[PDB]
Amino acid sequence: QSACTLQSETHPPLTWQKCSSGGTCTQQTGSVVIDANWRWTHATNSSTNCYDGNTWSSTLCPDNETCAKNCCLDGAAYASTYGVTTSGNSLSIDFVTQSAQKNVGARLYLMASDTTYQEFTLLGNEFSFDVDVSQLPCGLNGALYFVSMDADGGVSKYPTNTAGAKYGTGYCDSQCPRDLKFINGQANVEGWEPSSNNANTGIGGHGSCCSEMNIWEANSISEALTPHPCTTVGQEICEGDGCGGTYSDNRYGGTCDPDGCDWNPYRLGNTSFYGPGSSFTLDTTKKLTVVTQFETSGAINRYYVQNGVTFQQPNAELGSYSGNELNDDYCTAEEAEFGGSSFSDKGGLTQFKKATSGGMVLVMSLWDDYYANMLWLDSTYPTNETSSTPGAVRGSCSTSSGVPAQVESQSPNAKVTFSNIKFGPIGSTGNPSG
Protein backbone atom coordinates (compact mmCIF):
# COMPACT_ATOMS: atom_id res chain seq x y z
CA GLN A 1 0.00 0.00 0.00
CA SER A 2 0.98 3.64 -0.48
CA ALA A 3 0.20 6.49 1.88
CA CYS A 4 -2.39 9.22 1.36
CA THR A 5 -2.70 12.53 3.16
CA LEU A 6 -6.42 13.32 3.41
CA GLN A 7 -5.89 13.09 7.16
CA SER A 8 -2.55 14.08 8.66
CA GLU A 9 -0.44 11.54 10.56
CA THR A 10 0.92 12.91 13.82
CA HIS A 11 2.46 10.29 16.10
CA PRO A 12 1.75 11.05 19.79
CA PRO A 13 5.06 11.50 21.69
CA LEU A 14 6.21 9.11 24.41
CA THR A 15 9.41 9.31 26.43
CA TRP A 16 11.15 6.29 27.95
CA GLN A 17 14.43 5.66 29.79
CA LYS A 18 17.60 3.93 28.63
CA CYS A 19 19.85 2.80 31.49
CA SER A 20 23.48 1.70 31.59
CA SER A 21 25.54 -0.67 33.75
CA GLY A 22 27.28 2.39 35.19
CA GLY A 23 24.12 3.20 37.15
CA THR A 24 22.60 6.05 35.14
CA CYS A 25 19.43 6.29 33.07
CA THR A 26 18.79 8.88 30.36
CA GLN A 27 15.49 10.05 28.92
CA GLN A 28 14.78 9.06 25.33
CA THR A 29 12.07 10.63 23.20
CA GLY A 30 9.95 8.45 20.96
CA SER A 31 6.40 8.27 19.62
CA VAL A 32 3.72 5.68 18.89
CA VAL A 33 2.05 4.67 15.64
CA ILE A 34 -1.18 2.68 15.21
CA ASP A 35 -1.28 -0.54 13.18
CA ALA A 36 -2.32 -0.34 9.50
CA ASN A 37 -5.37 -2.57 10.03
CA TRP A 38 -7.04 0.17 12.05
CA ARG A 39 -6.58 2.79 9.33
CA TRP A 40 -8.86 4.09 6.62
CA THR A 41 -7.93 2.30 3.38
CA HIS A 42 -9.13 4.07 0.22
CA ALA A 43 -8.43 4.75 -3.45
CA THR A 44 -5.28 6.81 -4.04
CA ASN A 45 -7.17 9.21 -6.32
CA SER A 46 -10.44 9.44 -4.34
CA SER A 47 -12.21 8.95 -1.00
CA THR A 48 -13.73 5.65 -2.15
CA ASN A 49 -13.09 2.88 0.37
CA CYS A 50 -11.05 -0.13 -0.70
CA TYR A 51 -12.24 -1.93 2.41
CA ASP A 52 -15.59 -1.40 4.12
CA GLY A 53 -17.22 -3.38 6.91
CA ASN A 54 -15.51 -6.73 6.38
CA THR A 55 -15.34 -6.91 2.59
CA TRP A 56 -13.01 -5.54 -0.06
CA SER A 57 -14.07 -3.54 -3.11
CA SER A 58 -14.24 -6.13 -5.90
CA THR A 59 -13.47 -3.46 -8.52
CA LEU A 60 -10.61 -1.63 -6.78
CA CYS A 61 -9.29 -4.91 -5.36
CA PRO A 62 -9.75 -7.82 -7.81
CA ASP A 63 -6.45 -9.38 -6.66
CA ASN A 64 -3.63 -8.76 -4.16
CA GLU A 65 -1.33 -6.80 -6.47
CA THR A 66 -3.94 -4.59 -8.15
CA CYS A 67 -5.42 -3.78 -4.77
CA ALA A 68 -2.07 -2.65 -3.32
CA LYS A 69 -1.45 -0.45 -6.39
CA ASN A 70 -4.89 1.19 -6.25
CA CYS A 71 -5.13 1.61 -2.48
CA CYS A 72 -3.41 3.68 0.20
CA LEU A 73 -3.53 4.06 3.98
CA ASP A 74 -4.38 7.41 5.55
CA GLY A 75 -3.63 9.30 8.78
CA ALA A 76 -5.17 8.69 12.18
CA ALA A 77 -6.77 10.98 14.74
CA TYR A 78 -5.35 9.20 17.79
CA ALA A 79 -7.45 10.73 20.57
CA SER A 80 -10.82 11.35 18.90
CA THR A 81 -10.98 8.21 16.76
CA TYR A 82 -8.88 5.66 18.65
CA GLY A 83 -8.90 6.85 22.25
CA VAL A 84 -5.11 6.81 22.32
CA THR A 85 -3.41 9.54 24.36
CA THR A 86 0.06 10.10 25.83
CA SER A 87 1.36 12.34 28.61
CA GLY A 88 5.09 12.39 29.30
CA ASN A 89 6.09 8.77 29.89
CA SER A 90 2.46 7.62 30.05
CA LEU A 91 0.28 5.98 27.37
CA SER A 92 -3.44 5.23 27.79
CA ILE A 93 -5.67 3.19 25.49
CA ASP A 94 -9.47 3.35 25.73
CA PHE A 95 -11.43 0.19 24.98
CA VAL A 96 -14.31 1.56 22.92
CA THR A 97 -14.34 4.98 21.25
CA GLN A 98 -17.42 6.36 19.50
CA SER A 99 -16.86 8.92 16.75
CA ALA A 100 -18.34 8.64 13.24
CA GLN A 101 -17.80 4.92 13.78
CA LYS A 102 -17.19 2.59 16.71
CA ASN A 103 -13.58 1.66 17.36
CA VAL A 104 -12.48 -1.19 19.60
CA GLY A 105 -8.95 -1.13 20.98
CA ALA A 106 -5.71 -0.43 19.16
CA ARG A 107 -2.28 -1.91 18.49
CA LEU A 108 0.59 0.56 18.67
CA TYR A 109 4.36 0.44 18.00
CA LEU A 110 7.13 2.51 19.57
CA MET A 111 9.00 4.53 16.95
CA ALA A 112 12.64 5.68 16.82
CA SER A 113 11.74 8.38 14.31
CA ASP A 114 8.71 9.47 12.29
CA THR A 115 9.49 6.81 9.70
CA THR A 116 11.10 3.93 11.63
CA TYR A 117 10.42 1.56 14.53
CA GLN A 118 12.61 1.44 17.63
CA GLU A 119 14.36 -1.94 17.81
CA PHE A 120 15.41 -3.48 21.15
CA THR A 121 17.94 -6.27 21.70
CA LEU A 122 16.61 -8.06 24.78
CA LEU A 123 19.25 -10.75 25.45
CA GLY A 124 21.31 -9.75 28.47
CA ASN A 125 18.98 -6.83 29.21
CA GLU A 126 15.88 -6.13 31.27
CA PHE A 127 12.65 -4.29 30.47
CA SER A 128 10.64 -2.43 33.11
CA PHE A 129 7.26 -0.68 32.95
CA ASP A 130 4.44 0.48 35.23
CA VAL A 131 0.86 -0.52 34.54
CA ASP A 132 -2.65 0.20 35.76
CA VAL A 133 -4.93 -2.73 34.92
CA SER A 134 -7.65 -1.74 37.41
CA GLN A 135 -10.09 -0.89 34.60
CA LEU A 136 -9.65 -4.19 32.76
CA PRO A 137 -12.34 -6.78 33.60
CA CYS A 138 -12.73 -10.39 32.45
CA GLY A 139 -12.49 -10.83 28.69
CA LEU A 140 -9.98 -8.06 28.02
CA ASN A 141 -6.23 -8.12 27.41
CA GLY A 142 -3.96 -5.09 27.87
CA ALA A 143 -0.81 -6.40 26.20
CA LEU A 144 2.82 -5.27 26.00
CA TYR A 145 5.09 -7.51 23.95
CA PHE A 146 7.87 -7.76 21.37
CA VAL A 147 7.87 -9.15 17.82
CA SER A 148 10.63 -9.55 15.25
CA MET A 149 9.37 -6.88 12.82
CA ASP A 150 11.55 -4.90 10.36
CA ALA A 151 12.49 -1.35 11.37
CA ASP A 152 11.09 0.10 8.14
CA GLY A 153 7.85 -1.88 8.23
CA GLY A 154 9.08 -3.97 5.30
CA VAL A 155 9.63 -1.20 2.74
CA SER A 156 13.13 -2.36 1.68
CA LYS A 157 11.96 -5.93 1.05
CA TYR A 158 8.64 -5.08 -0.62
CA PRO A 159 8.76 -2.06 -3.02
CA THR A 160 4.96 -1.85 -3.40
CA ASN A 161 4.75 -0.90 0.28
CA THR A 162 5.62 2.80 0.46
CA ALA A 163 3.60 3.63 3.59
CA GLY A 164 6.07 1.89 5.88
CA ALA A 165 6.57 2.19 9.63
CA LYS A 166 5.04 5.69 9.58
CA TYR A 167 1.69 4.02 8.83
CA GLY A 168 2.19 0.96 11.01
CA THR A 169 2.84 -1.66 8.34
CA GLY A 170 4.79 -4.90 8.73
CA TYR A 171 3.10 -6.67 11.64
CA CYS A 172 3.76 -10.33 12.37
CA ASP A 173 3.60 -12.61 15.38
CA SER A 174 3.59 -16.27 16.44
CA GLN A 175 -0.05 -16.88 15.49
CA CYS A 176 0.74 -15.99 11.85
CA PRO A 177 -2.26 -13.60 11.70
CA ARG A 178 -4.35 -13.91 8.54
CA ASP A 179 -6.60 -10.99 9.50
CA LEU A 180 -4.04 -8.46 8.25
CA LYS A 181 -5.30 -6.50 5.24
CA PHE A 182 -1.80 -5.87 3.87
CA ILE A 183 1.17 -8.27 4.02
CA ASN A 184 4.46 -8.03 2.10
CA GLY A 185 3.48 -4.94 0.11
CA GLN A 186 0.27 -6.58 -1.13
CA ALA A 187 -3.37 -6.79 -0.07
CA ASN A 188 -4.84 -9.92 1.52
CA VAL A 189 -7.97 -9.88 -0.64
CA GLU A 190 -7.32 -13.27 -2.25
CA GLY A 191 -9.05 -16.02 -0.27
CA TRP A 192 -10.75 -13.48 2.00
CA GLU A 193 -13.45 -14.80 4.32
CA PRO A 194 -15.51 -12.27 6.29
CA SER A 195 -15.94 -13.02 10.00
CA SER A 196 -19.33 -14.49 10.91
CA ASN A 197 -19.10 -12.95 14.39
CA ASN A 198 -17.28 -9.70 13.62
CA ALA A 199 -18.67 -7.23 11.10
CA ASN A 200 -15.30 -5.48 10.77
CA THR A 201 -12.82 -8.30 10.22
CA GLY A 202 -12.06 -11.32 8.10
CA ILE A 203 -9.44 -13.92 7.21
CA GLY A 204 -7.33 -13.71 4.07
CA GLY A 205 -5.38 -16.39 2.24
CA HIS A 206 -2.03 -15.28 3.69
CA GLY A 207 -0.56 -14.68 7.13
CA SER A 208 2.50 -12.98 8.62
CA CYS A 209 4.70 -15.00 11.00
CA CYS A 210 7.56 -14.10 13.35
CA SER A 211 8.99 -14.68 16.82
CA GLU A 212 7.05 -13.19 19.67
CA MET A 213 7.90 -12.33 23.27
CA ASN A 214 4.69 -11.78 25.22
CA ILE A 215 6.08 -9.99 28.23
CA TRP A 216 2.65 -8.97 29.45
CA GLU A 217 -0.85 -10.22 28.66
CA ALA A 218 -3.25 -9.32 31.43
CA ASN A 219 -6.32 -7.79 33.01
CA SER A 220 -7.24 -7.21 36.68
CA ILE A 221 -7.78 -10.96 37.11
CA SER A 222 -4.89 -12.80 35.43
CA GLU A 223 -1.49 -12.25 33.83
CA ALA A 224 0.87 -14.41 31.79
CA LEU A 225 4.46 -14.25 30.49
CA THR A 226 4.99 -16.21 27.27
CA PRO A 227 7.86 -16.68 24.75
CA HIS A 228 6.93 -18.03 21.29
CA PRO A 229 9.68 -19.35 19.02
CA CYS A 230 9.47 -19.80 15.24
CA THR A 231 11.68 -21.86 12.91
CA THR A 232 12.13 -18.62 10.96
CA VAL A 233 12.99 -15.83 13.40
CA GLY A 234 11.92 -12.78 11.39
CA GLN A 235 8.82 -11.81 9.43
CA GLU A 236 7.71 -14.32 6.81
CA ILE A 237 4.50 -14.70 4.83
CA CYS A 238 2.60 -18.00 5.10
CA GLU A 239 -0.15 -19.49 2.94
CA GLY A 240 -3.56 -20.84 3.93
CA ASP A 241 -3.81 -23.52 6.60
CA GLY A 242 -0.04 -23.88 6.31
CA CYS A 243 0.04 -20.82 8.54
CA GLY A 244 -1.23 -22.64 11.62
CA GLY A 245 -2.19 -20.43 14.54
CA THR A 246 -5.65 -19.32 15.63
CA TYR A 247 -6.88 -18.18 12.22
CA SER A 248 -6.12 -21.49 10.46
CA ASP A 249 -7.43 -25.05 10.71
CA ASN A 250 -4.38 -27.08 11.76
CA ARG A 251 -3.00 -25.04 14.66
CA TYR A 252 0.40 -26.74 14.81
CA GLY A 253 1.10 -27.16 11.11
CA GLY A 254 2.97 -23.87 10.79
CA THR A 255 6.50 -22.60 11.40
CA CYS A 256 5.58 -20.83 14.64
CA ASP A 257 4.54 -21.99 18.10
CA PRO A 258 1.07 -20.46 18.75
CA ASP A 259 0.97 -21.67 22.36
CA GLY A 260 4.34 -20.82 23.85
CA CYS A 261 5.85 -21.69 27.20
CA ASP A 262 3.51 -19.64 29.36
CA TRP A 263 3.83 -18.67 32.99
CA ASN A 264 0.58 -17.66 34.71
CA PRO A 265 0.94 -17.59 38.55
CA TYR A 266 -2.74 -18.50 38.98
CA ARG A 267 -2.54 -21.35 36.46
CA LEU A 268 0.49 -22.70 38.30
CA GLY A 269 -1.27 -22.84 41.66
CA ASN A 270 -0.84 -19.53 43.47
CA THR A 271 -4.38 -18.13 43.41
CA SER A 272 -3.66 -15.42 46.00
CA PHE A 273 -0.78 -13.65 44.26
CA TYR A 274 -2.39 -11.41 41.64
CA GLY A 275 -5.93 -10.09 41.85
CA PRO A 276 -8.23 -7.13 42.67
CA GLY A 277 -8.12 -6.14 46.33
CA SER A 278 -6.03 -6.22 49.49
CA SER A 279 -6.44 -10.00 49.89
CA PHE A 280 -3.94 -10.48 47.05
CA THR A 281 -0.14 -10.03 47.19
CA LEU A 282 -0.34 -7.72 44.18
CA ASP A 283 -3.45 -5.53 44.33
CA THR A 284 -4.59 -4.94 40.73
CA THR A 285 -6.77 -2.00 41.74
CA LYS A 286 -3.46 -0.14 42.20
CA LYS A 287 -0.58 0.51 39.82
CA LEU A 288 2.34 -1.94 39.76
CA THR A 289 5.83 -2.28 38.26
CA VAL A 290 6.78 -5.29 36.16
CA VAL A 291 10.45 -6.14 35.54
CA THR A 292 11.51 -8.85 33.09
CA GLN A 293 15.12 -10.03 32.71
CA PHE A 294 16.57 -11.94 29.74
CA GLU A 295 19.74 -13.69 30.86
CA THR A 296 22.31 -14.98 28.37
CA SER A 297 21.49 -18.62 29.11
CA GLY A 298 18.11 -18.08 27.49
CA ALA A 299 16.11 -18.23 30.72
CA ILE A 300 13.75 -15.46 31.81
CA ASN A 301 13.38 -13.95 35.27
CA ARG A 302 10.71 -11.69 36.69
CA TYR A 303 10.00 -9.59 39.77
CA TYR A 304 7.32 -7.00 40.63
CA VAL A 305 7.25 -3.86 42.72
CA GLN A 306 4.18 -2.32 44.34
CA ASN A 307 4.20 0.41 46.99
CA GLY A 308 7.96 0.00 47.19
CA VAL A 309 7.86 -3.70 48.10
CA THR A 310 9.53 -6.23 45.79
CA PHE A 311 8.09 -9.65 44.97
CA GLN A 312 9.94 -12.18 42.82
CA GLN A 313 7.86 -14.33 40.48
CA PRO A 314 6.13 -16.77 42.89
CA ASN A 315 7.57 -20.25 43.29
CA ALA A 316 5.90 -23.03 41.35
CA GLU A 317 6.17 -26.81 41.50
CA LEU A 318 5.32 -28.66 38.31
CA GLY A 319 6.37 -32.28 37.93
CA SER A 320 10.10 -32.49 38.58
CA TYR A 321 10.44 -28.72 38.33
CA SER A 322 10.53 -26.31 41.26
CA GLY A 323 11.49 -22.64 41.15
CA ASN A 324 10.49 -19.20 39.89
CA GLU A 325 12.52 -18.96 36.68
CA LEU A 326 11.20 -19.61 33.17
CA ASN A 327 13.83 -22.01 31.81
CA ASP A 328 14.22 -25.24 29.82
CA ASP A 329 13.28 -27.36 32.82
CA TYR A 330 10.07 -25.43 33.38
CA CYS A 331 9.01 -25.56 29.72
CA THR A 332 9.78 -29.28 29.51
CA ALA A 333 7.82 -30.03 32.69
CA GLU A 334 4.91 -27.90 31.50
CA GLU A 335 4.53 -29.89 28.30
CA ALA A 336 4.74 -33.09 30.36
CA GLU A 337 2.12 -32.03 32.92
CA PHE A 338 -0.18 -29.74 30.89
CA GLY A 339 0.36 -31.50 27.57
CA GLY A 340 1.57 -30.27 24.20
CA SER A 341 4.76 -30.34 22.13
CA SER A 342 4.56 -27.15 20.08
CA PHE A 343 7.11 -25.12 22.08
CA SER A 344 9.72 -27.87 22.03
CA ASP A 345 8.97 -28.76 18.40
CA LYS A 346 9.82 -25.17 17.47
CA GLY A 347 13.21 -25.23 19.17
CA GLY A 348 12.26 -24.08 22.65
CA LEU A 349 14.27 -21.40 24.45
CA THR A 350 17.37 -22.10 22.37
CA GLN A 351 15.66 -21.17 19.10
CA PHE A 352 14.00 -18.27 20.89
CA LYS A 353 17.42 -16.96 21.91
CA LYS A 354 17.96 -16.23 18.21
CA ALA A 355 15.03 -13.80 18.34
CA THR A 356 16.16 -12.01 21.51
CA SER A 357 19.73 -11.80 20.20
CA GLY A 358 18.38 -9.66 17.37
CA GLY A 359 16.15 -6.60 17.25
CA MET A 360 12.48 -6.69 18.25
CA VAL A 361 9.78 -4.01 18.06
CA LEU A 362 7.75 -2.93 21.11
CA VAL A 363 3.99 -3.40 20.80
CA MET A 364 1.29 -2.13 23.17
CA SER A 365 -2.36 -3.02 22.67
CA LEU A 366 -5.82 -3.59 24.12
CA TRP A 367 -8.12 -6.21 22.65
CA ASP A 368 -11.03 -8.55 23.27
CA ASP A 369 -11.05 -12.11 21.93
CA TYR A 370 -13.51 -13.02 19.16
CA TYR A 371 -12.17 -16.57 18.93
CA ALA A 372 -11.94 -17.79 22.53
CA ASN A 373 -13.32 -14.97 24.71
CA MET A 374 -9.95 -14.67 26.52
CA LEU A 375 -10.90 -17.82 28.46
CA TRP A 376 -7.36 -19.13 27.89
CA LEU A 377 -6.09 -16.23 30.03
CA ASP A 378 -8.56 -15.73 32.87
CA SER A 379 -10.93 -18.70 33.11
CA THR A 380 -11.15 -22.48 32.82
CA TYR A 381 -10.16 -23.64 29.35
CA PRO A 382 -11.41 -25.64 27.58
CA THR A 383 -14.77 -24.89 29.23
CA ASN A 384 -15.67 -28.60 29.37
CA GLU A 385 -12.64 -29.31 31.59
CA THR A 386 -12.66 -29.32 35.38
CA SER A 387 -10.29 -28.07 38.09
CA SER A 388 -8.94 -31.61 38.55
CA THR A 389 -7.43 -31.36 35.07
CA PRO A 390 -3.82 -30.07 35.23
CA GLY A 391 -3.60 -26.53 33.88
CA ALA A 392 -7.29 -26.11 32.97
CA VAL A 393 -7.90 -23.25 35.42
CA ARG A 394 -6.08 -20.03 34.51
CA GLY A 395 -8.24 -17.50 36.33
CA SER A 396 -11.43 -16.93 38.31
CA CYS A 397 -13.56 -15.56 35.46
CA SER A 398 -16.72 -17.43 34.54
CA THR A 399 -16.49 -19.62 31.45
CA SER A 400 -19.30 -17.44 30.11
CA SER A 401 -17.30 -14.22 30.36
CA GLY A 402 -15.57 -12.40 27.53
CA VAL A 403 -18.31 -12.25 24.88
CA PRO A 404 -17.04 -9.36 22.71
CA ALA A 405 -20.45 -7.84 22.00
CA GLN A 406 -21.28 -7.99 25.72
CA VAL A 407 -18.07 -6.52 27.18
CA GLU A 408 -18.00 -3.83 24.49
CA SER A 409 -21.47 -2.62 25.48
CA GLN A 410 -21.11 -3.21 29.23
CA SER A 411 -17.57 -1.92 29.77
CA PRO A 412 -16.88 0.67 27.05
CA ASN A 413 -14.93 2.86 29.50
CA ALA A 414 -12.39 0.12 30.19
CA LYS A 415 -8.81 1.19 29.49
CA VAL A 416 -5.18 0.45 30.26
CA THR A 417 -2.30 2.75 31.14
CA PHE A 418 1.34 1.84 30.50
CA SER A 419 3.99 4.20 31.82
CA ASN A 420 7.60 4.63 32.98
CA ILE A 421 9.24 2.28 30.45
CA LYS A 422 12.90 1.66 31.31
CA PHE A 423 15.39 -0.52 29.45
CA GLY A 424 19.01 -1.41 30.03
CA PRO A 425 21.43 -4.12 31.20
CA ILE A 426 20.21 -6.56 33.87
CA GLY A 427 20.17 -4.84 37.26
CA SER A 428 20.09 -1.30 35.88
CA THR A 429 16.46 -0.16 35.49
CA GLY A 430 15.87 0.29 39.21
CA ASN A 431 18.36 3.16 39.26
CA PRO A 432 17.42 6.90 39.22
CA SER A 433 15.72 8.08 36.02
CA GLY A 434 17.30 10.92 34.07
Q: What x-and-dash track marks residues 289-328 binding ligand NAG by CB under 6 A?
A: ----------------------x--x--------------
223 binds, among ligand NAG, Ca ion, none (CB under 5 to 8 A by kind): none
33 binds, among ligand NAG, Ca ion, none (CB under 5 to 8 A by kind): none
Among 130, 173, 335, 369, binds Ca ion (CB under 5 A): 173
Closest by alpha carbon to 433, among 12, 25, 23, 3?
25
Minimum CB separation from Ca ion for residue 78, in Å?
23
Is residue 270 involved in binding ligand NAG (CB under 6 A)? Answer: yes
Query: In this complex, which beta carbon is closest to ligand NAG, that of residue 191 or of residue 319?
Result: 319
- As beta bridge partners, residue 87 has 90
Residues 305-364 that bind Ca ion (CB under 5 A): none
Catalytic: which of 126, 217, 325, 408? Answer: 217
Query: In this complex, which beta carbon is closest to ligand NAG, that of residue 234 or of residue 314?
Result: 314
The 10 Å Cβ neighbour count of residue 278 is 8
- Strands 274-275 and 282-283 come out as parallel
Among 252, 273, 338, 371, binds ligand NAG (CB under 6 A): 273
Query: In this complex, which beta carbon is closest to ligand NAG, that of residue 146 or of residue 321?
Result: 321
Query: In this complex, which beta carbon is closest to ligand NAG, that of residue 48 or of residue 270?
Result: 270
Closest by alpha carbon to 288, among 275, 270, 301?
275
Distance CA 321, CA 316 (A): 8
Query: In this complex, which beta carbon is closest to ligand NAG, that of residue 311 or of residue 338?
Result: 311
- Choose the stretch contacting Ca ion; rule: CB under 5 A; options: 62-70, 95-103, 109-117, 298-306: 298-306
- As beta bridge partners, residue 301 has 293
Minimum CB separation from ligand NAG for residue 219, in Å?
19
314 binds, among ligand NAG, Ca ion, none (CB under 5 to 8 A by kind): ligand NAG
Query: In this complex, which beta carbon is closest to ligand NAG, that of residue 252 or of residue 311?
Result: 311
Is residue 262 involved in binding Ca ion (CB under 5 A)? Answer: no
Give, in order, the Cα–Cα distances in Å from 30 to each of 11, 112, 119, 306, 405: 9, 6, 12, 26, 35
Distance CA 424, CA 431 (A): 10
187 touches 179 (CB < 8 A): no
Minimum CB separation from Ca ion for residue 35, in Å?
12
Query: In this complex, which beta carbon is closest to Ca ion, that of residue 299 or of residue 360?
Result: 299
Q: Where are the beta strands (DSSP E) in 168-211?
A: 182-183, 186-187, 193-194, 202-203, 206-209
Q: ∠ at Cα 273 (269, 279), nearest 5°? A: 125
- Choose the stretch contacting Ca ion; rule: CB under 5 A; options: 166-174, 187-195, 200-208, 390-398: 166-174
Known catalytic membership, residue 212: yes
260 binds, among ligand NAG, Ca ion, none (CB under 5 to 8 A by kind): none
Which DSSP category does 241 fall into?
Answer: G
Q: How big is the chain by its Cα radius of gyration, in Å?
A: 21
Size of the site for ligand NAG (CB under 6 A): 6
Q: What does the DSSP assignment read for 352-402?
A: HHHHHTS-EEEEEEEEE-TTTTTHHHHSBSSTT--TTSTT-B--SS-TT--
Query: In this complex, which beta carbon is closest to ligand NAG, that of residue 48 or of residue 306?
Result: 306
Minimum CB separation from Ca ion for residue 180, in Å?
12
Minimum CB separation from Ca ion for residue 7, in Å?
28
Minimum CB separation from ligand NAG for residue 267, in Å?
13
Known catalytic membership, residue 217: yes
Torsion (CA) 393, 394, 396, 400 in degrees, nearest 10: -80
Q: ∠ at Cα 253 (252, 258), nearest 5°? A: 35
Catalytic: which of 9, 65, 119, 212? Answer: 212
Among 272, 297, 341, 413, binds ligand NAG (CB under 6 A): 272
90 touches 17 (CB < 8 A): no
- Choose the stretch contacting ligand NAG; rule: CB under 6 A; options: 89-97, 213-221, 267-275, 339-347: 267-275
Cα torsion 147, 148, 152, 158: sign: negative
The 10 Å Cβ neighbour count of residue 432 is 9
Distance CA 63, CA 49 (A): 16
Residues with catalytic roles = 212, 217
| Interface contacts to ligand NAG, rule CB under 6 A | 270, 272-273, 281, 311, 314
